[PDB]
Structures are given as C-alpha cells and as structure tokens.
C-alpha cells in the first residue's frame, strides 16, 4: 500500500483505490495503474519534474529503502497480475530490485522529489508508475 499526497490530491495505485477514492475521483487510467482523488487537507509531497534515472524506492516487504537505476517511462508488456490481464502497462519504469504484489504504492524519489509509485514487478524486477508527466498535480 501507499499513496502520494500532493496539494489536495491523493495518488494511488488504481487497483488499490477505495470506494472513497472513486466517490471523489479526479482522474484514473487503467493502462497506467493510477487513480487520483481529492483530499480536504493539502499534501506534503513535491512531485519531481525531471528525467532522472536514479533514485530510491521504499520496499514494504523488506522494510527498506533501496537506491536504484530505472528505465524512462514506457509501454512495457506486463505479465498478468490478479488486478490486470497484462496489456501494455504504459508510463512504466523498471529497476533491478526485489518487489511483491503488496509492495505496490512504495514511493520512488529522486533529488527533485516523488517520481512515481511501485505498480509492477516481473523477472525484469520492479516497475514504478511514473507521475512526473502529471503537471496538473501541481496546480488547481
Ligand atoms: C511489485 C509487484 C507487482 C506484482 C507482482 N506479481 C504479479 O504481477 C503476479 C501475481 C501472481 C504472481 O505474480 N510482483 C511484484
Ligand atoms: Zn529527478
């Protein structure tokens, strides 16, 4: 589990979104495994605006933060999970690092702030749904 709290927005894995998230929907995209809902309070997260390929991610199944190199956001074929058949998971970044299904929601961060959240994890290893293209997260 995990979310990004930026301004009055909550960014979660679409497959972990709650009823309250869907009842307060701002934007969702199945292809990206992302959903954004509204919050009453303002959030303490700075989204990165950058093309970094190095950062650190939180891995709940290790209680550890790991430094990683990651690929730029792309349309990877992702192998079937419980929540998606496979499709081309878009805006996905892959690193070499451990992950399990429950690790979805761990922040990846660079020197500029939050890059994305764990979403996928194949043999390739850990995939992070990028949020850095979502400029609108910073305004209104
Ligand atoms: C971070 C992450 C996300 C998903 C997965 N696992 C899968 O997609 C499938 C489900 C059944 C066995 O593997 N592993 C890691
Ligand atoms: Zn950066």
Swiss-Prot record:
<comment type="subunit">
    <text>Homodimer.</text>
</comment>
<feature type="active site" description="For protease 2A activity">
    <location>
        <position position="15"/>
    </location>
</feature>
<protein>
    <recommendedName>
        <fullName>Protease 2A</fullName>
    </recommendedName>
</protein>
<feature type="binding site">
    <location>
        <position position="50"/>
    </location>
    <ligand>
        <name>Zn(2+) 1</name>
    </ligand>
</feature>
<feature type="binding site">
    <location>
        <position position="52"/>
    </location>
    <ligand>
        <name>Zn(2+) 1</name>
    </ligand>
</feature>
<feature type="binding site">
    <location>
        <position position="110"/>
    </location>
    <ligand>
        <name>Zn(2+) 1</name>
    </ligand>
</feature>
<comment type="function">
    <text>Cysteine protease that cleaves viral polyprotein and specific host proteins. It is responsible for the autocatalytic cleavage between the P1 and P2 regions, which is the first cleavage occurring in the polyprotein. Also cleaves the host translation initiation factor EIF4G1, in order to shut down the capped cellular mRNA translation. Inhibits the host nucleus-cytoplasm protein and RNA trafficking by cleaving host members of the nuclear pores. Counteracts stress granule formation probably by antagonizing its assembly or promoting its dissassembly.</text>
</comment>
<feature type="active site" description="For protease 2A activity">
    <location>
        <position position="33"/>
    </location>
</feature>
<feature type="binding site">
    <location>
        <position position="112"/>
    </location>
    <ligand>
        <name>Zn(2+) 1</name>
    </ligand>
</feature>
<feature type="active site" description="For protease 2A activity">
    <location>
        <position position="104"/>
    </location>
</feature>
